[PDB]
Amino acid sequence: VGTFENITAAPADPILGLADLFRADERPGKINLGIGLYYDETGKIPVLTSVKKAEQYLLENETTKLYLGIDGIPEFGRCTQELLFGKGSALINDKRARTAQTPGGSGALRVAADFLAKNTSVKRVWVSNPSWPNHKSVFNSAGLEVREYAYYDAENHTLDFDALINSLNEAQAGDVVLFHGCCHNPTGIDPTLEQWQTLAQLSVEKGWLPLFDFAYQGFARGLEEDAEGLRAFAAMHKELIVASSYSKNFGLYNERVGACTLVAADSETVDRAFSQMKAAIRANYSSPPAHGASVVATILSNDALRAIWEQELTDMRQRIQRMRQLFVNTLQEKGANRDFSFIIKQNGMFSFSGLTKEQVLRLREEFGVYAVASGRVNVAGMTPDNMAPLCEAIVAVL
Amino acid sequence: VGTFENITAAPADPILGLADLFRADERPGKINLGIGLYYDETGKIPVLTSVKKAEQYLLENETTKLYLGIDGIPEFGRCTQELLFGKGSALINDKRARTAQTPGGSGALRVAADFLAKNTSVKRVWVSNPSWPNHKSVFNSAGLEVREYAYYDAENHTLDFDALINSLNEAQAGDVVLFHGCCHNPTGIDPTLEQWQTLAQLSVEKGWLPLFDFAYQGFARGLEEDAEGLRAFAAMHKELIVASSYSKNFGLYNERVGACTLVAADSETVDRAFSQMKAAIRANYSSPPAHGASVVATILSNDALRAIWEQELTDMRQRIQRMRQLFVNTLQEKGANRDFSFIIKQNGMFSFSGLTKEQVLRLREEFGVYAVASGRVNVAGMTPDNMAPLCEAIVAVL
Ligand SMILES: Cc1ncc(COP(=O)(O)O)c(C=O)c1O
Ligand SMILES: Cc1ncc(COP(=O)(O)O)c(C=O)c1O
């Protein structure tokens, strides 16, 4: 009697399964608007110049591949805290935060989930509906219940703040509430500063533990501005957790560079808690991969490389905003009667197109255009060369 | 009332806690025989030449960092299966095996444990007494019970084959039994081929699911020879799991390069099982880090680089063998009256020294010689320059 005989096949990942269909499609002119990769104006996914410079430096100067500590490169953790909280933050001066280098933002989310499930009485995590599909899997893998809160007004293409507030009414003291720090995935709709401040006050009154997922810092307005919501929470909370990723804003997707940051009331408490976070990492992958995080730490700690990187990040933010405008314009030019102007108000790589599952299927099967079944399209996959055919396809299924 | 306030500090890792103490130790003569790192004759922990050359190729030819698939680089998987099972194996031609690239051997162990606990009826894993200390933590954290079988005869410094087989008669069908492929950690004592064949037959009769941990392929006798015990299992079993590591045989510790290989009765079953292993990876770190695995796959797939690497591995293995001999001879010269000849018959980086916990504590506090509290010593940390002080210290505590 085989152990593997009773196993049920896993469903296809809603995002990665799509990219597998795309790689199999033999039809010429297929267009990939699925997975969240940054493409340049020629349809390629390049390595940043700042990253190549840093990798050259590492090649010439690394003398050993000796294991990192469980929590990773120390300079990486410190530069990360400055990015998130600000160079002179009280949180850093009071030594209230500890950061672990992790394998991507995904790995940072799993490390937090394992830590919470094993060392606290947290039973429940609240996630926006919609959210990144993998959020539920990560927290469920540690045995945590995941509930959903309302977020998106699909009528006005706006944040439904009233429904958000009402739907979080039953989130209890000691529940985790997950917020996207900026560039909400998939809607591209973020709270305003005043909405963030309102959420911060309510969180402290209700006793929630906030967990911020930061995968797109620098893609909305700028590095400092995109962190304003987080910093409004950090000014008011004793405790919070930040999972952050450098996959997107350094174009380091496949090197798995992220961080999990813990904040507690004081230095002694966060050190105690962090020692249990390190134990959860040790029972998982033991210590994190060095190459990607070394690149990031090299760039952030060298003024000249850092200035190259900040300009590269700006050029990527601006290309995406330009494509958002060109998309709306070309849809009108190609004859759409539906108003797509809301696309211009959305932030980051993704917008909710408002297409139905049926229309997304038609686009894939009839026109070779690949989006996620929720209607999320990757605007950063749009180029001046593929824009007209893409828009003709959409207009055809409207 | 903070969520983190009542968390208890985690105890130190028996291996990584020692490394921290050693780093902080201010004495210039300190000697590190704890963590399993390869040192060259001069006390350095070098990057291999094959690896530097492969990294230079990657630097100049890499055009993108786009995500690998969940299971990683395909050539890496194929080359791993060839090393494990042999260039013309029936497991491979029958398409009975699927491999996922993982963040180290540690990550491969957690992926297997998550996959087992979430998709099968397995409740119990059997691990040798003694074993690598992190084995229990990994399987306990996935929710599996850990049971110990007998292995080492401490009086005779030998494998107690009878005790082992008696202990394992309590293991039931559908339990997982974990075997070290070669260079048993910490004892350095491995089954002979005959004993492997005996366990393999006994394994099918009782219905165990074998799990091989293969972190030292090439450090006992040779690449092919060190897999004989696994290949005897593979010829008889419908199902098995191998977690393997390239940290040590490539000196790639901090890049986290390993693999989890699943074997099932046929191609249809292993694909069904592998789909759930991918789901378990997706909810952990999503996809594995590219740099380290790309280096390995570049080396194994290029005949000139492979030849360099295979010579560098031979040199490491022989250097360790020369140190085992030198250690025994120098102990007698420095006035030890115990017979340490058993060290010569142990394989790999580690010997079980027979020192007590109290003697190990003295070696550290009074002499700055760092060994694990079990008395395991890293022979690969021994050099001609530190042999005399190390042996004088040991004689002083007998
Ligand atoms: C909201 C959110 N969190 C986490 C991630 C995962 O990032 P990473 O590739 O660093 O694991 C993504 C993007 O993939 C994301 O959009
Ligand atoms: C038996 C055994 N399994 C697994 C590992 C973990 O290897 P890695 O560093 O690749 O995670 C080690 C040592 O590191 C080991 O000795």
Author numbering:
A (entry chain A), B (entry chain B): -1 to 396
Could you share sentences copied from the article?
To determine if these differences in the temperature dependence of exchange could be observed in the crystal state, we also solved the maleate-free structures of WT, HEX, and VFIT at 303 K, and calculated isomorphous difference density maps by subtracting electron density at 278 K. By contrast, similar comparisons for WT and HEX showed relatively little difference density. We calculated ΔG at 278 K for HEX to be –1.72 kcal mol–1, a small difference that would be compatible with the interconversion between these two states to be part of the catalytic cycle.
E. coli aspartate aminotransferase (AAT) is a pyridoxal phosphate (PLP)-dependent enzyme that catalyses the reversible transamination of l-aspartate with α-ketoglutarate, yielding oxaloacetate and l-glutamate. During its catalytic cycle, AAT undergoes hinge movement to switch between an open conformation, in the ligand-free form, and a closed conformation upon association with substrates or inhibitors. Using our approach, we enrich the less populated but catalytically active closed conformation in order to increase catalytic efficiency (kcat/KM) with the non-native substrate l-phenylalanine, leading to altered substrate selectivity. Steady-state kinetics reveal kcat/KM increases of up to 100-fold towards this aromatic amino acid, resulting in a selectivity switch of up to 1900-fold, and structural analyses by room-temperature X-ray crystallography and multitemperature nuclear magnetic resonance (NMR) spectroscopy confirm that the conformational landscape is remodeled to favor the target state.
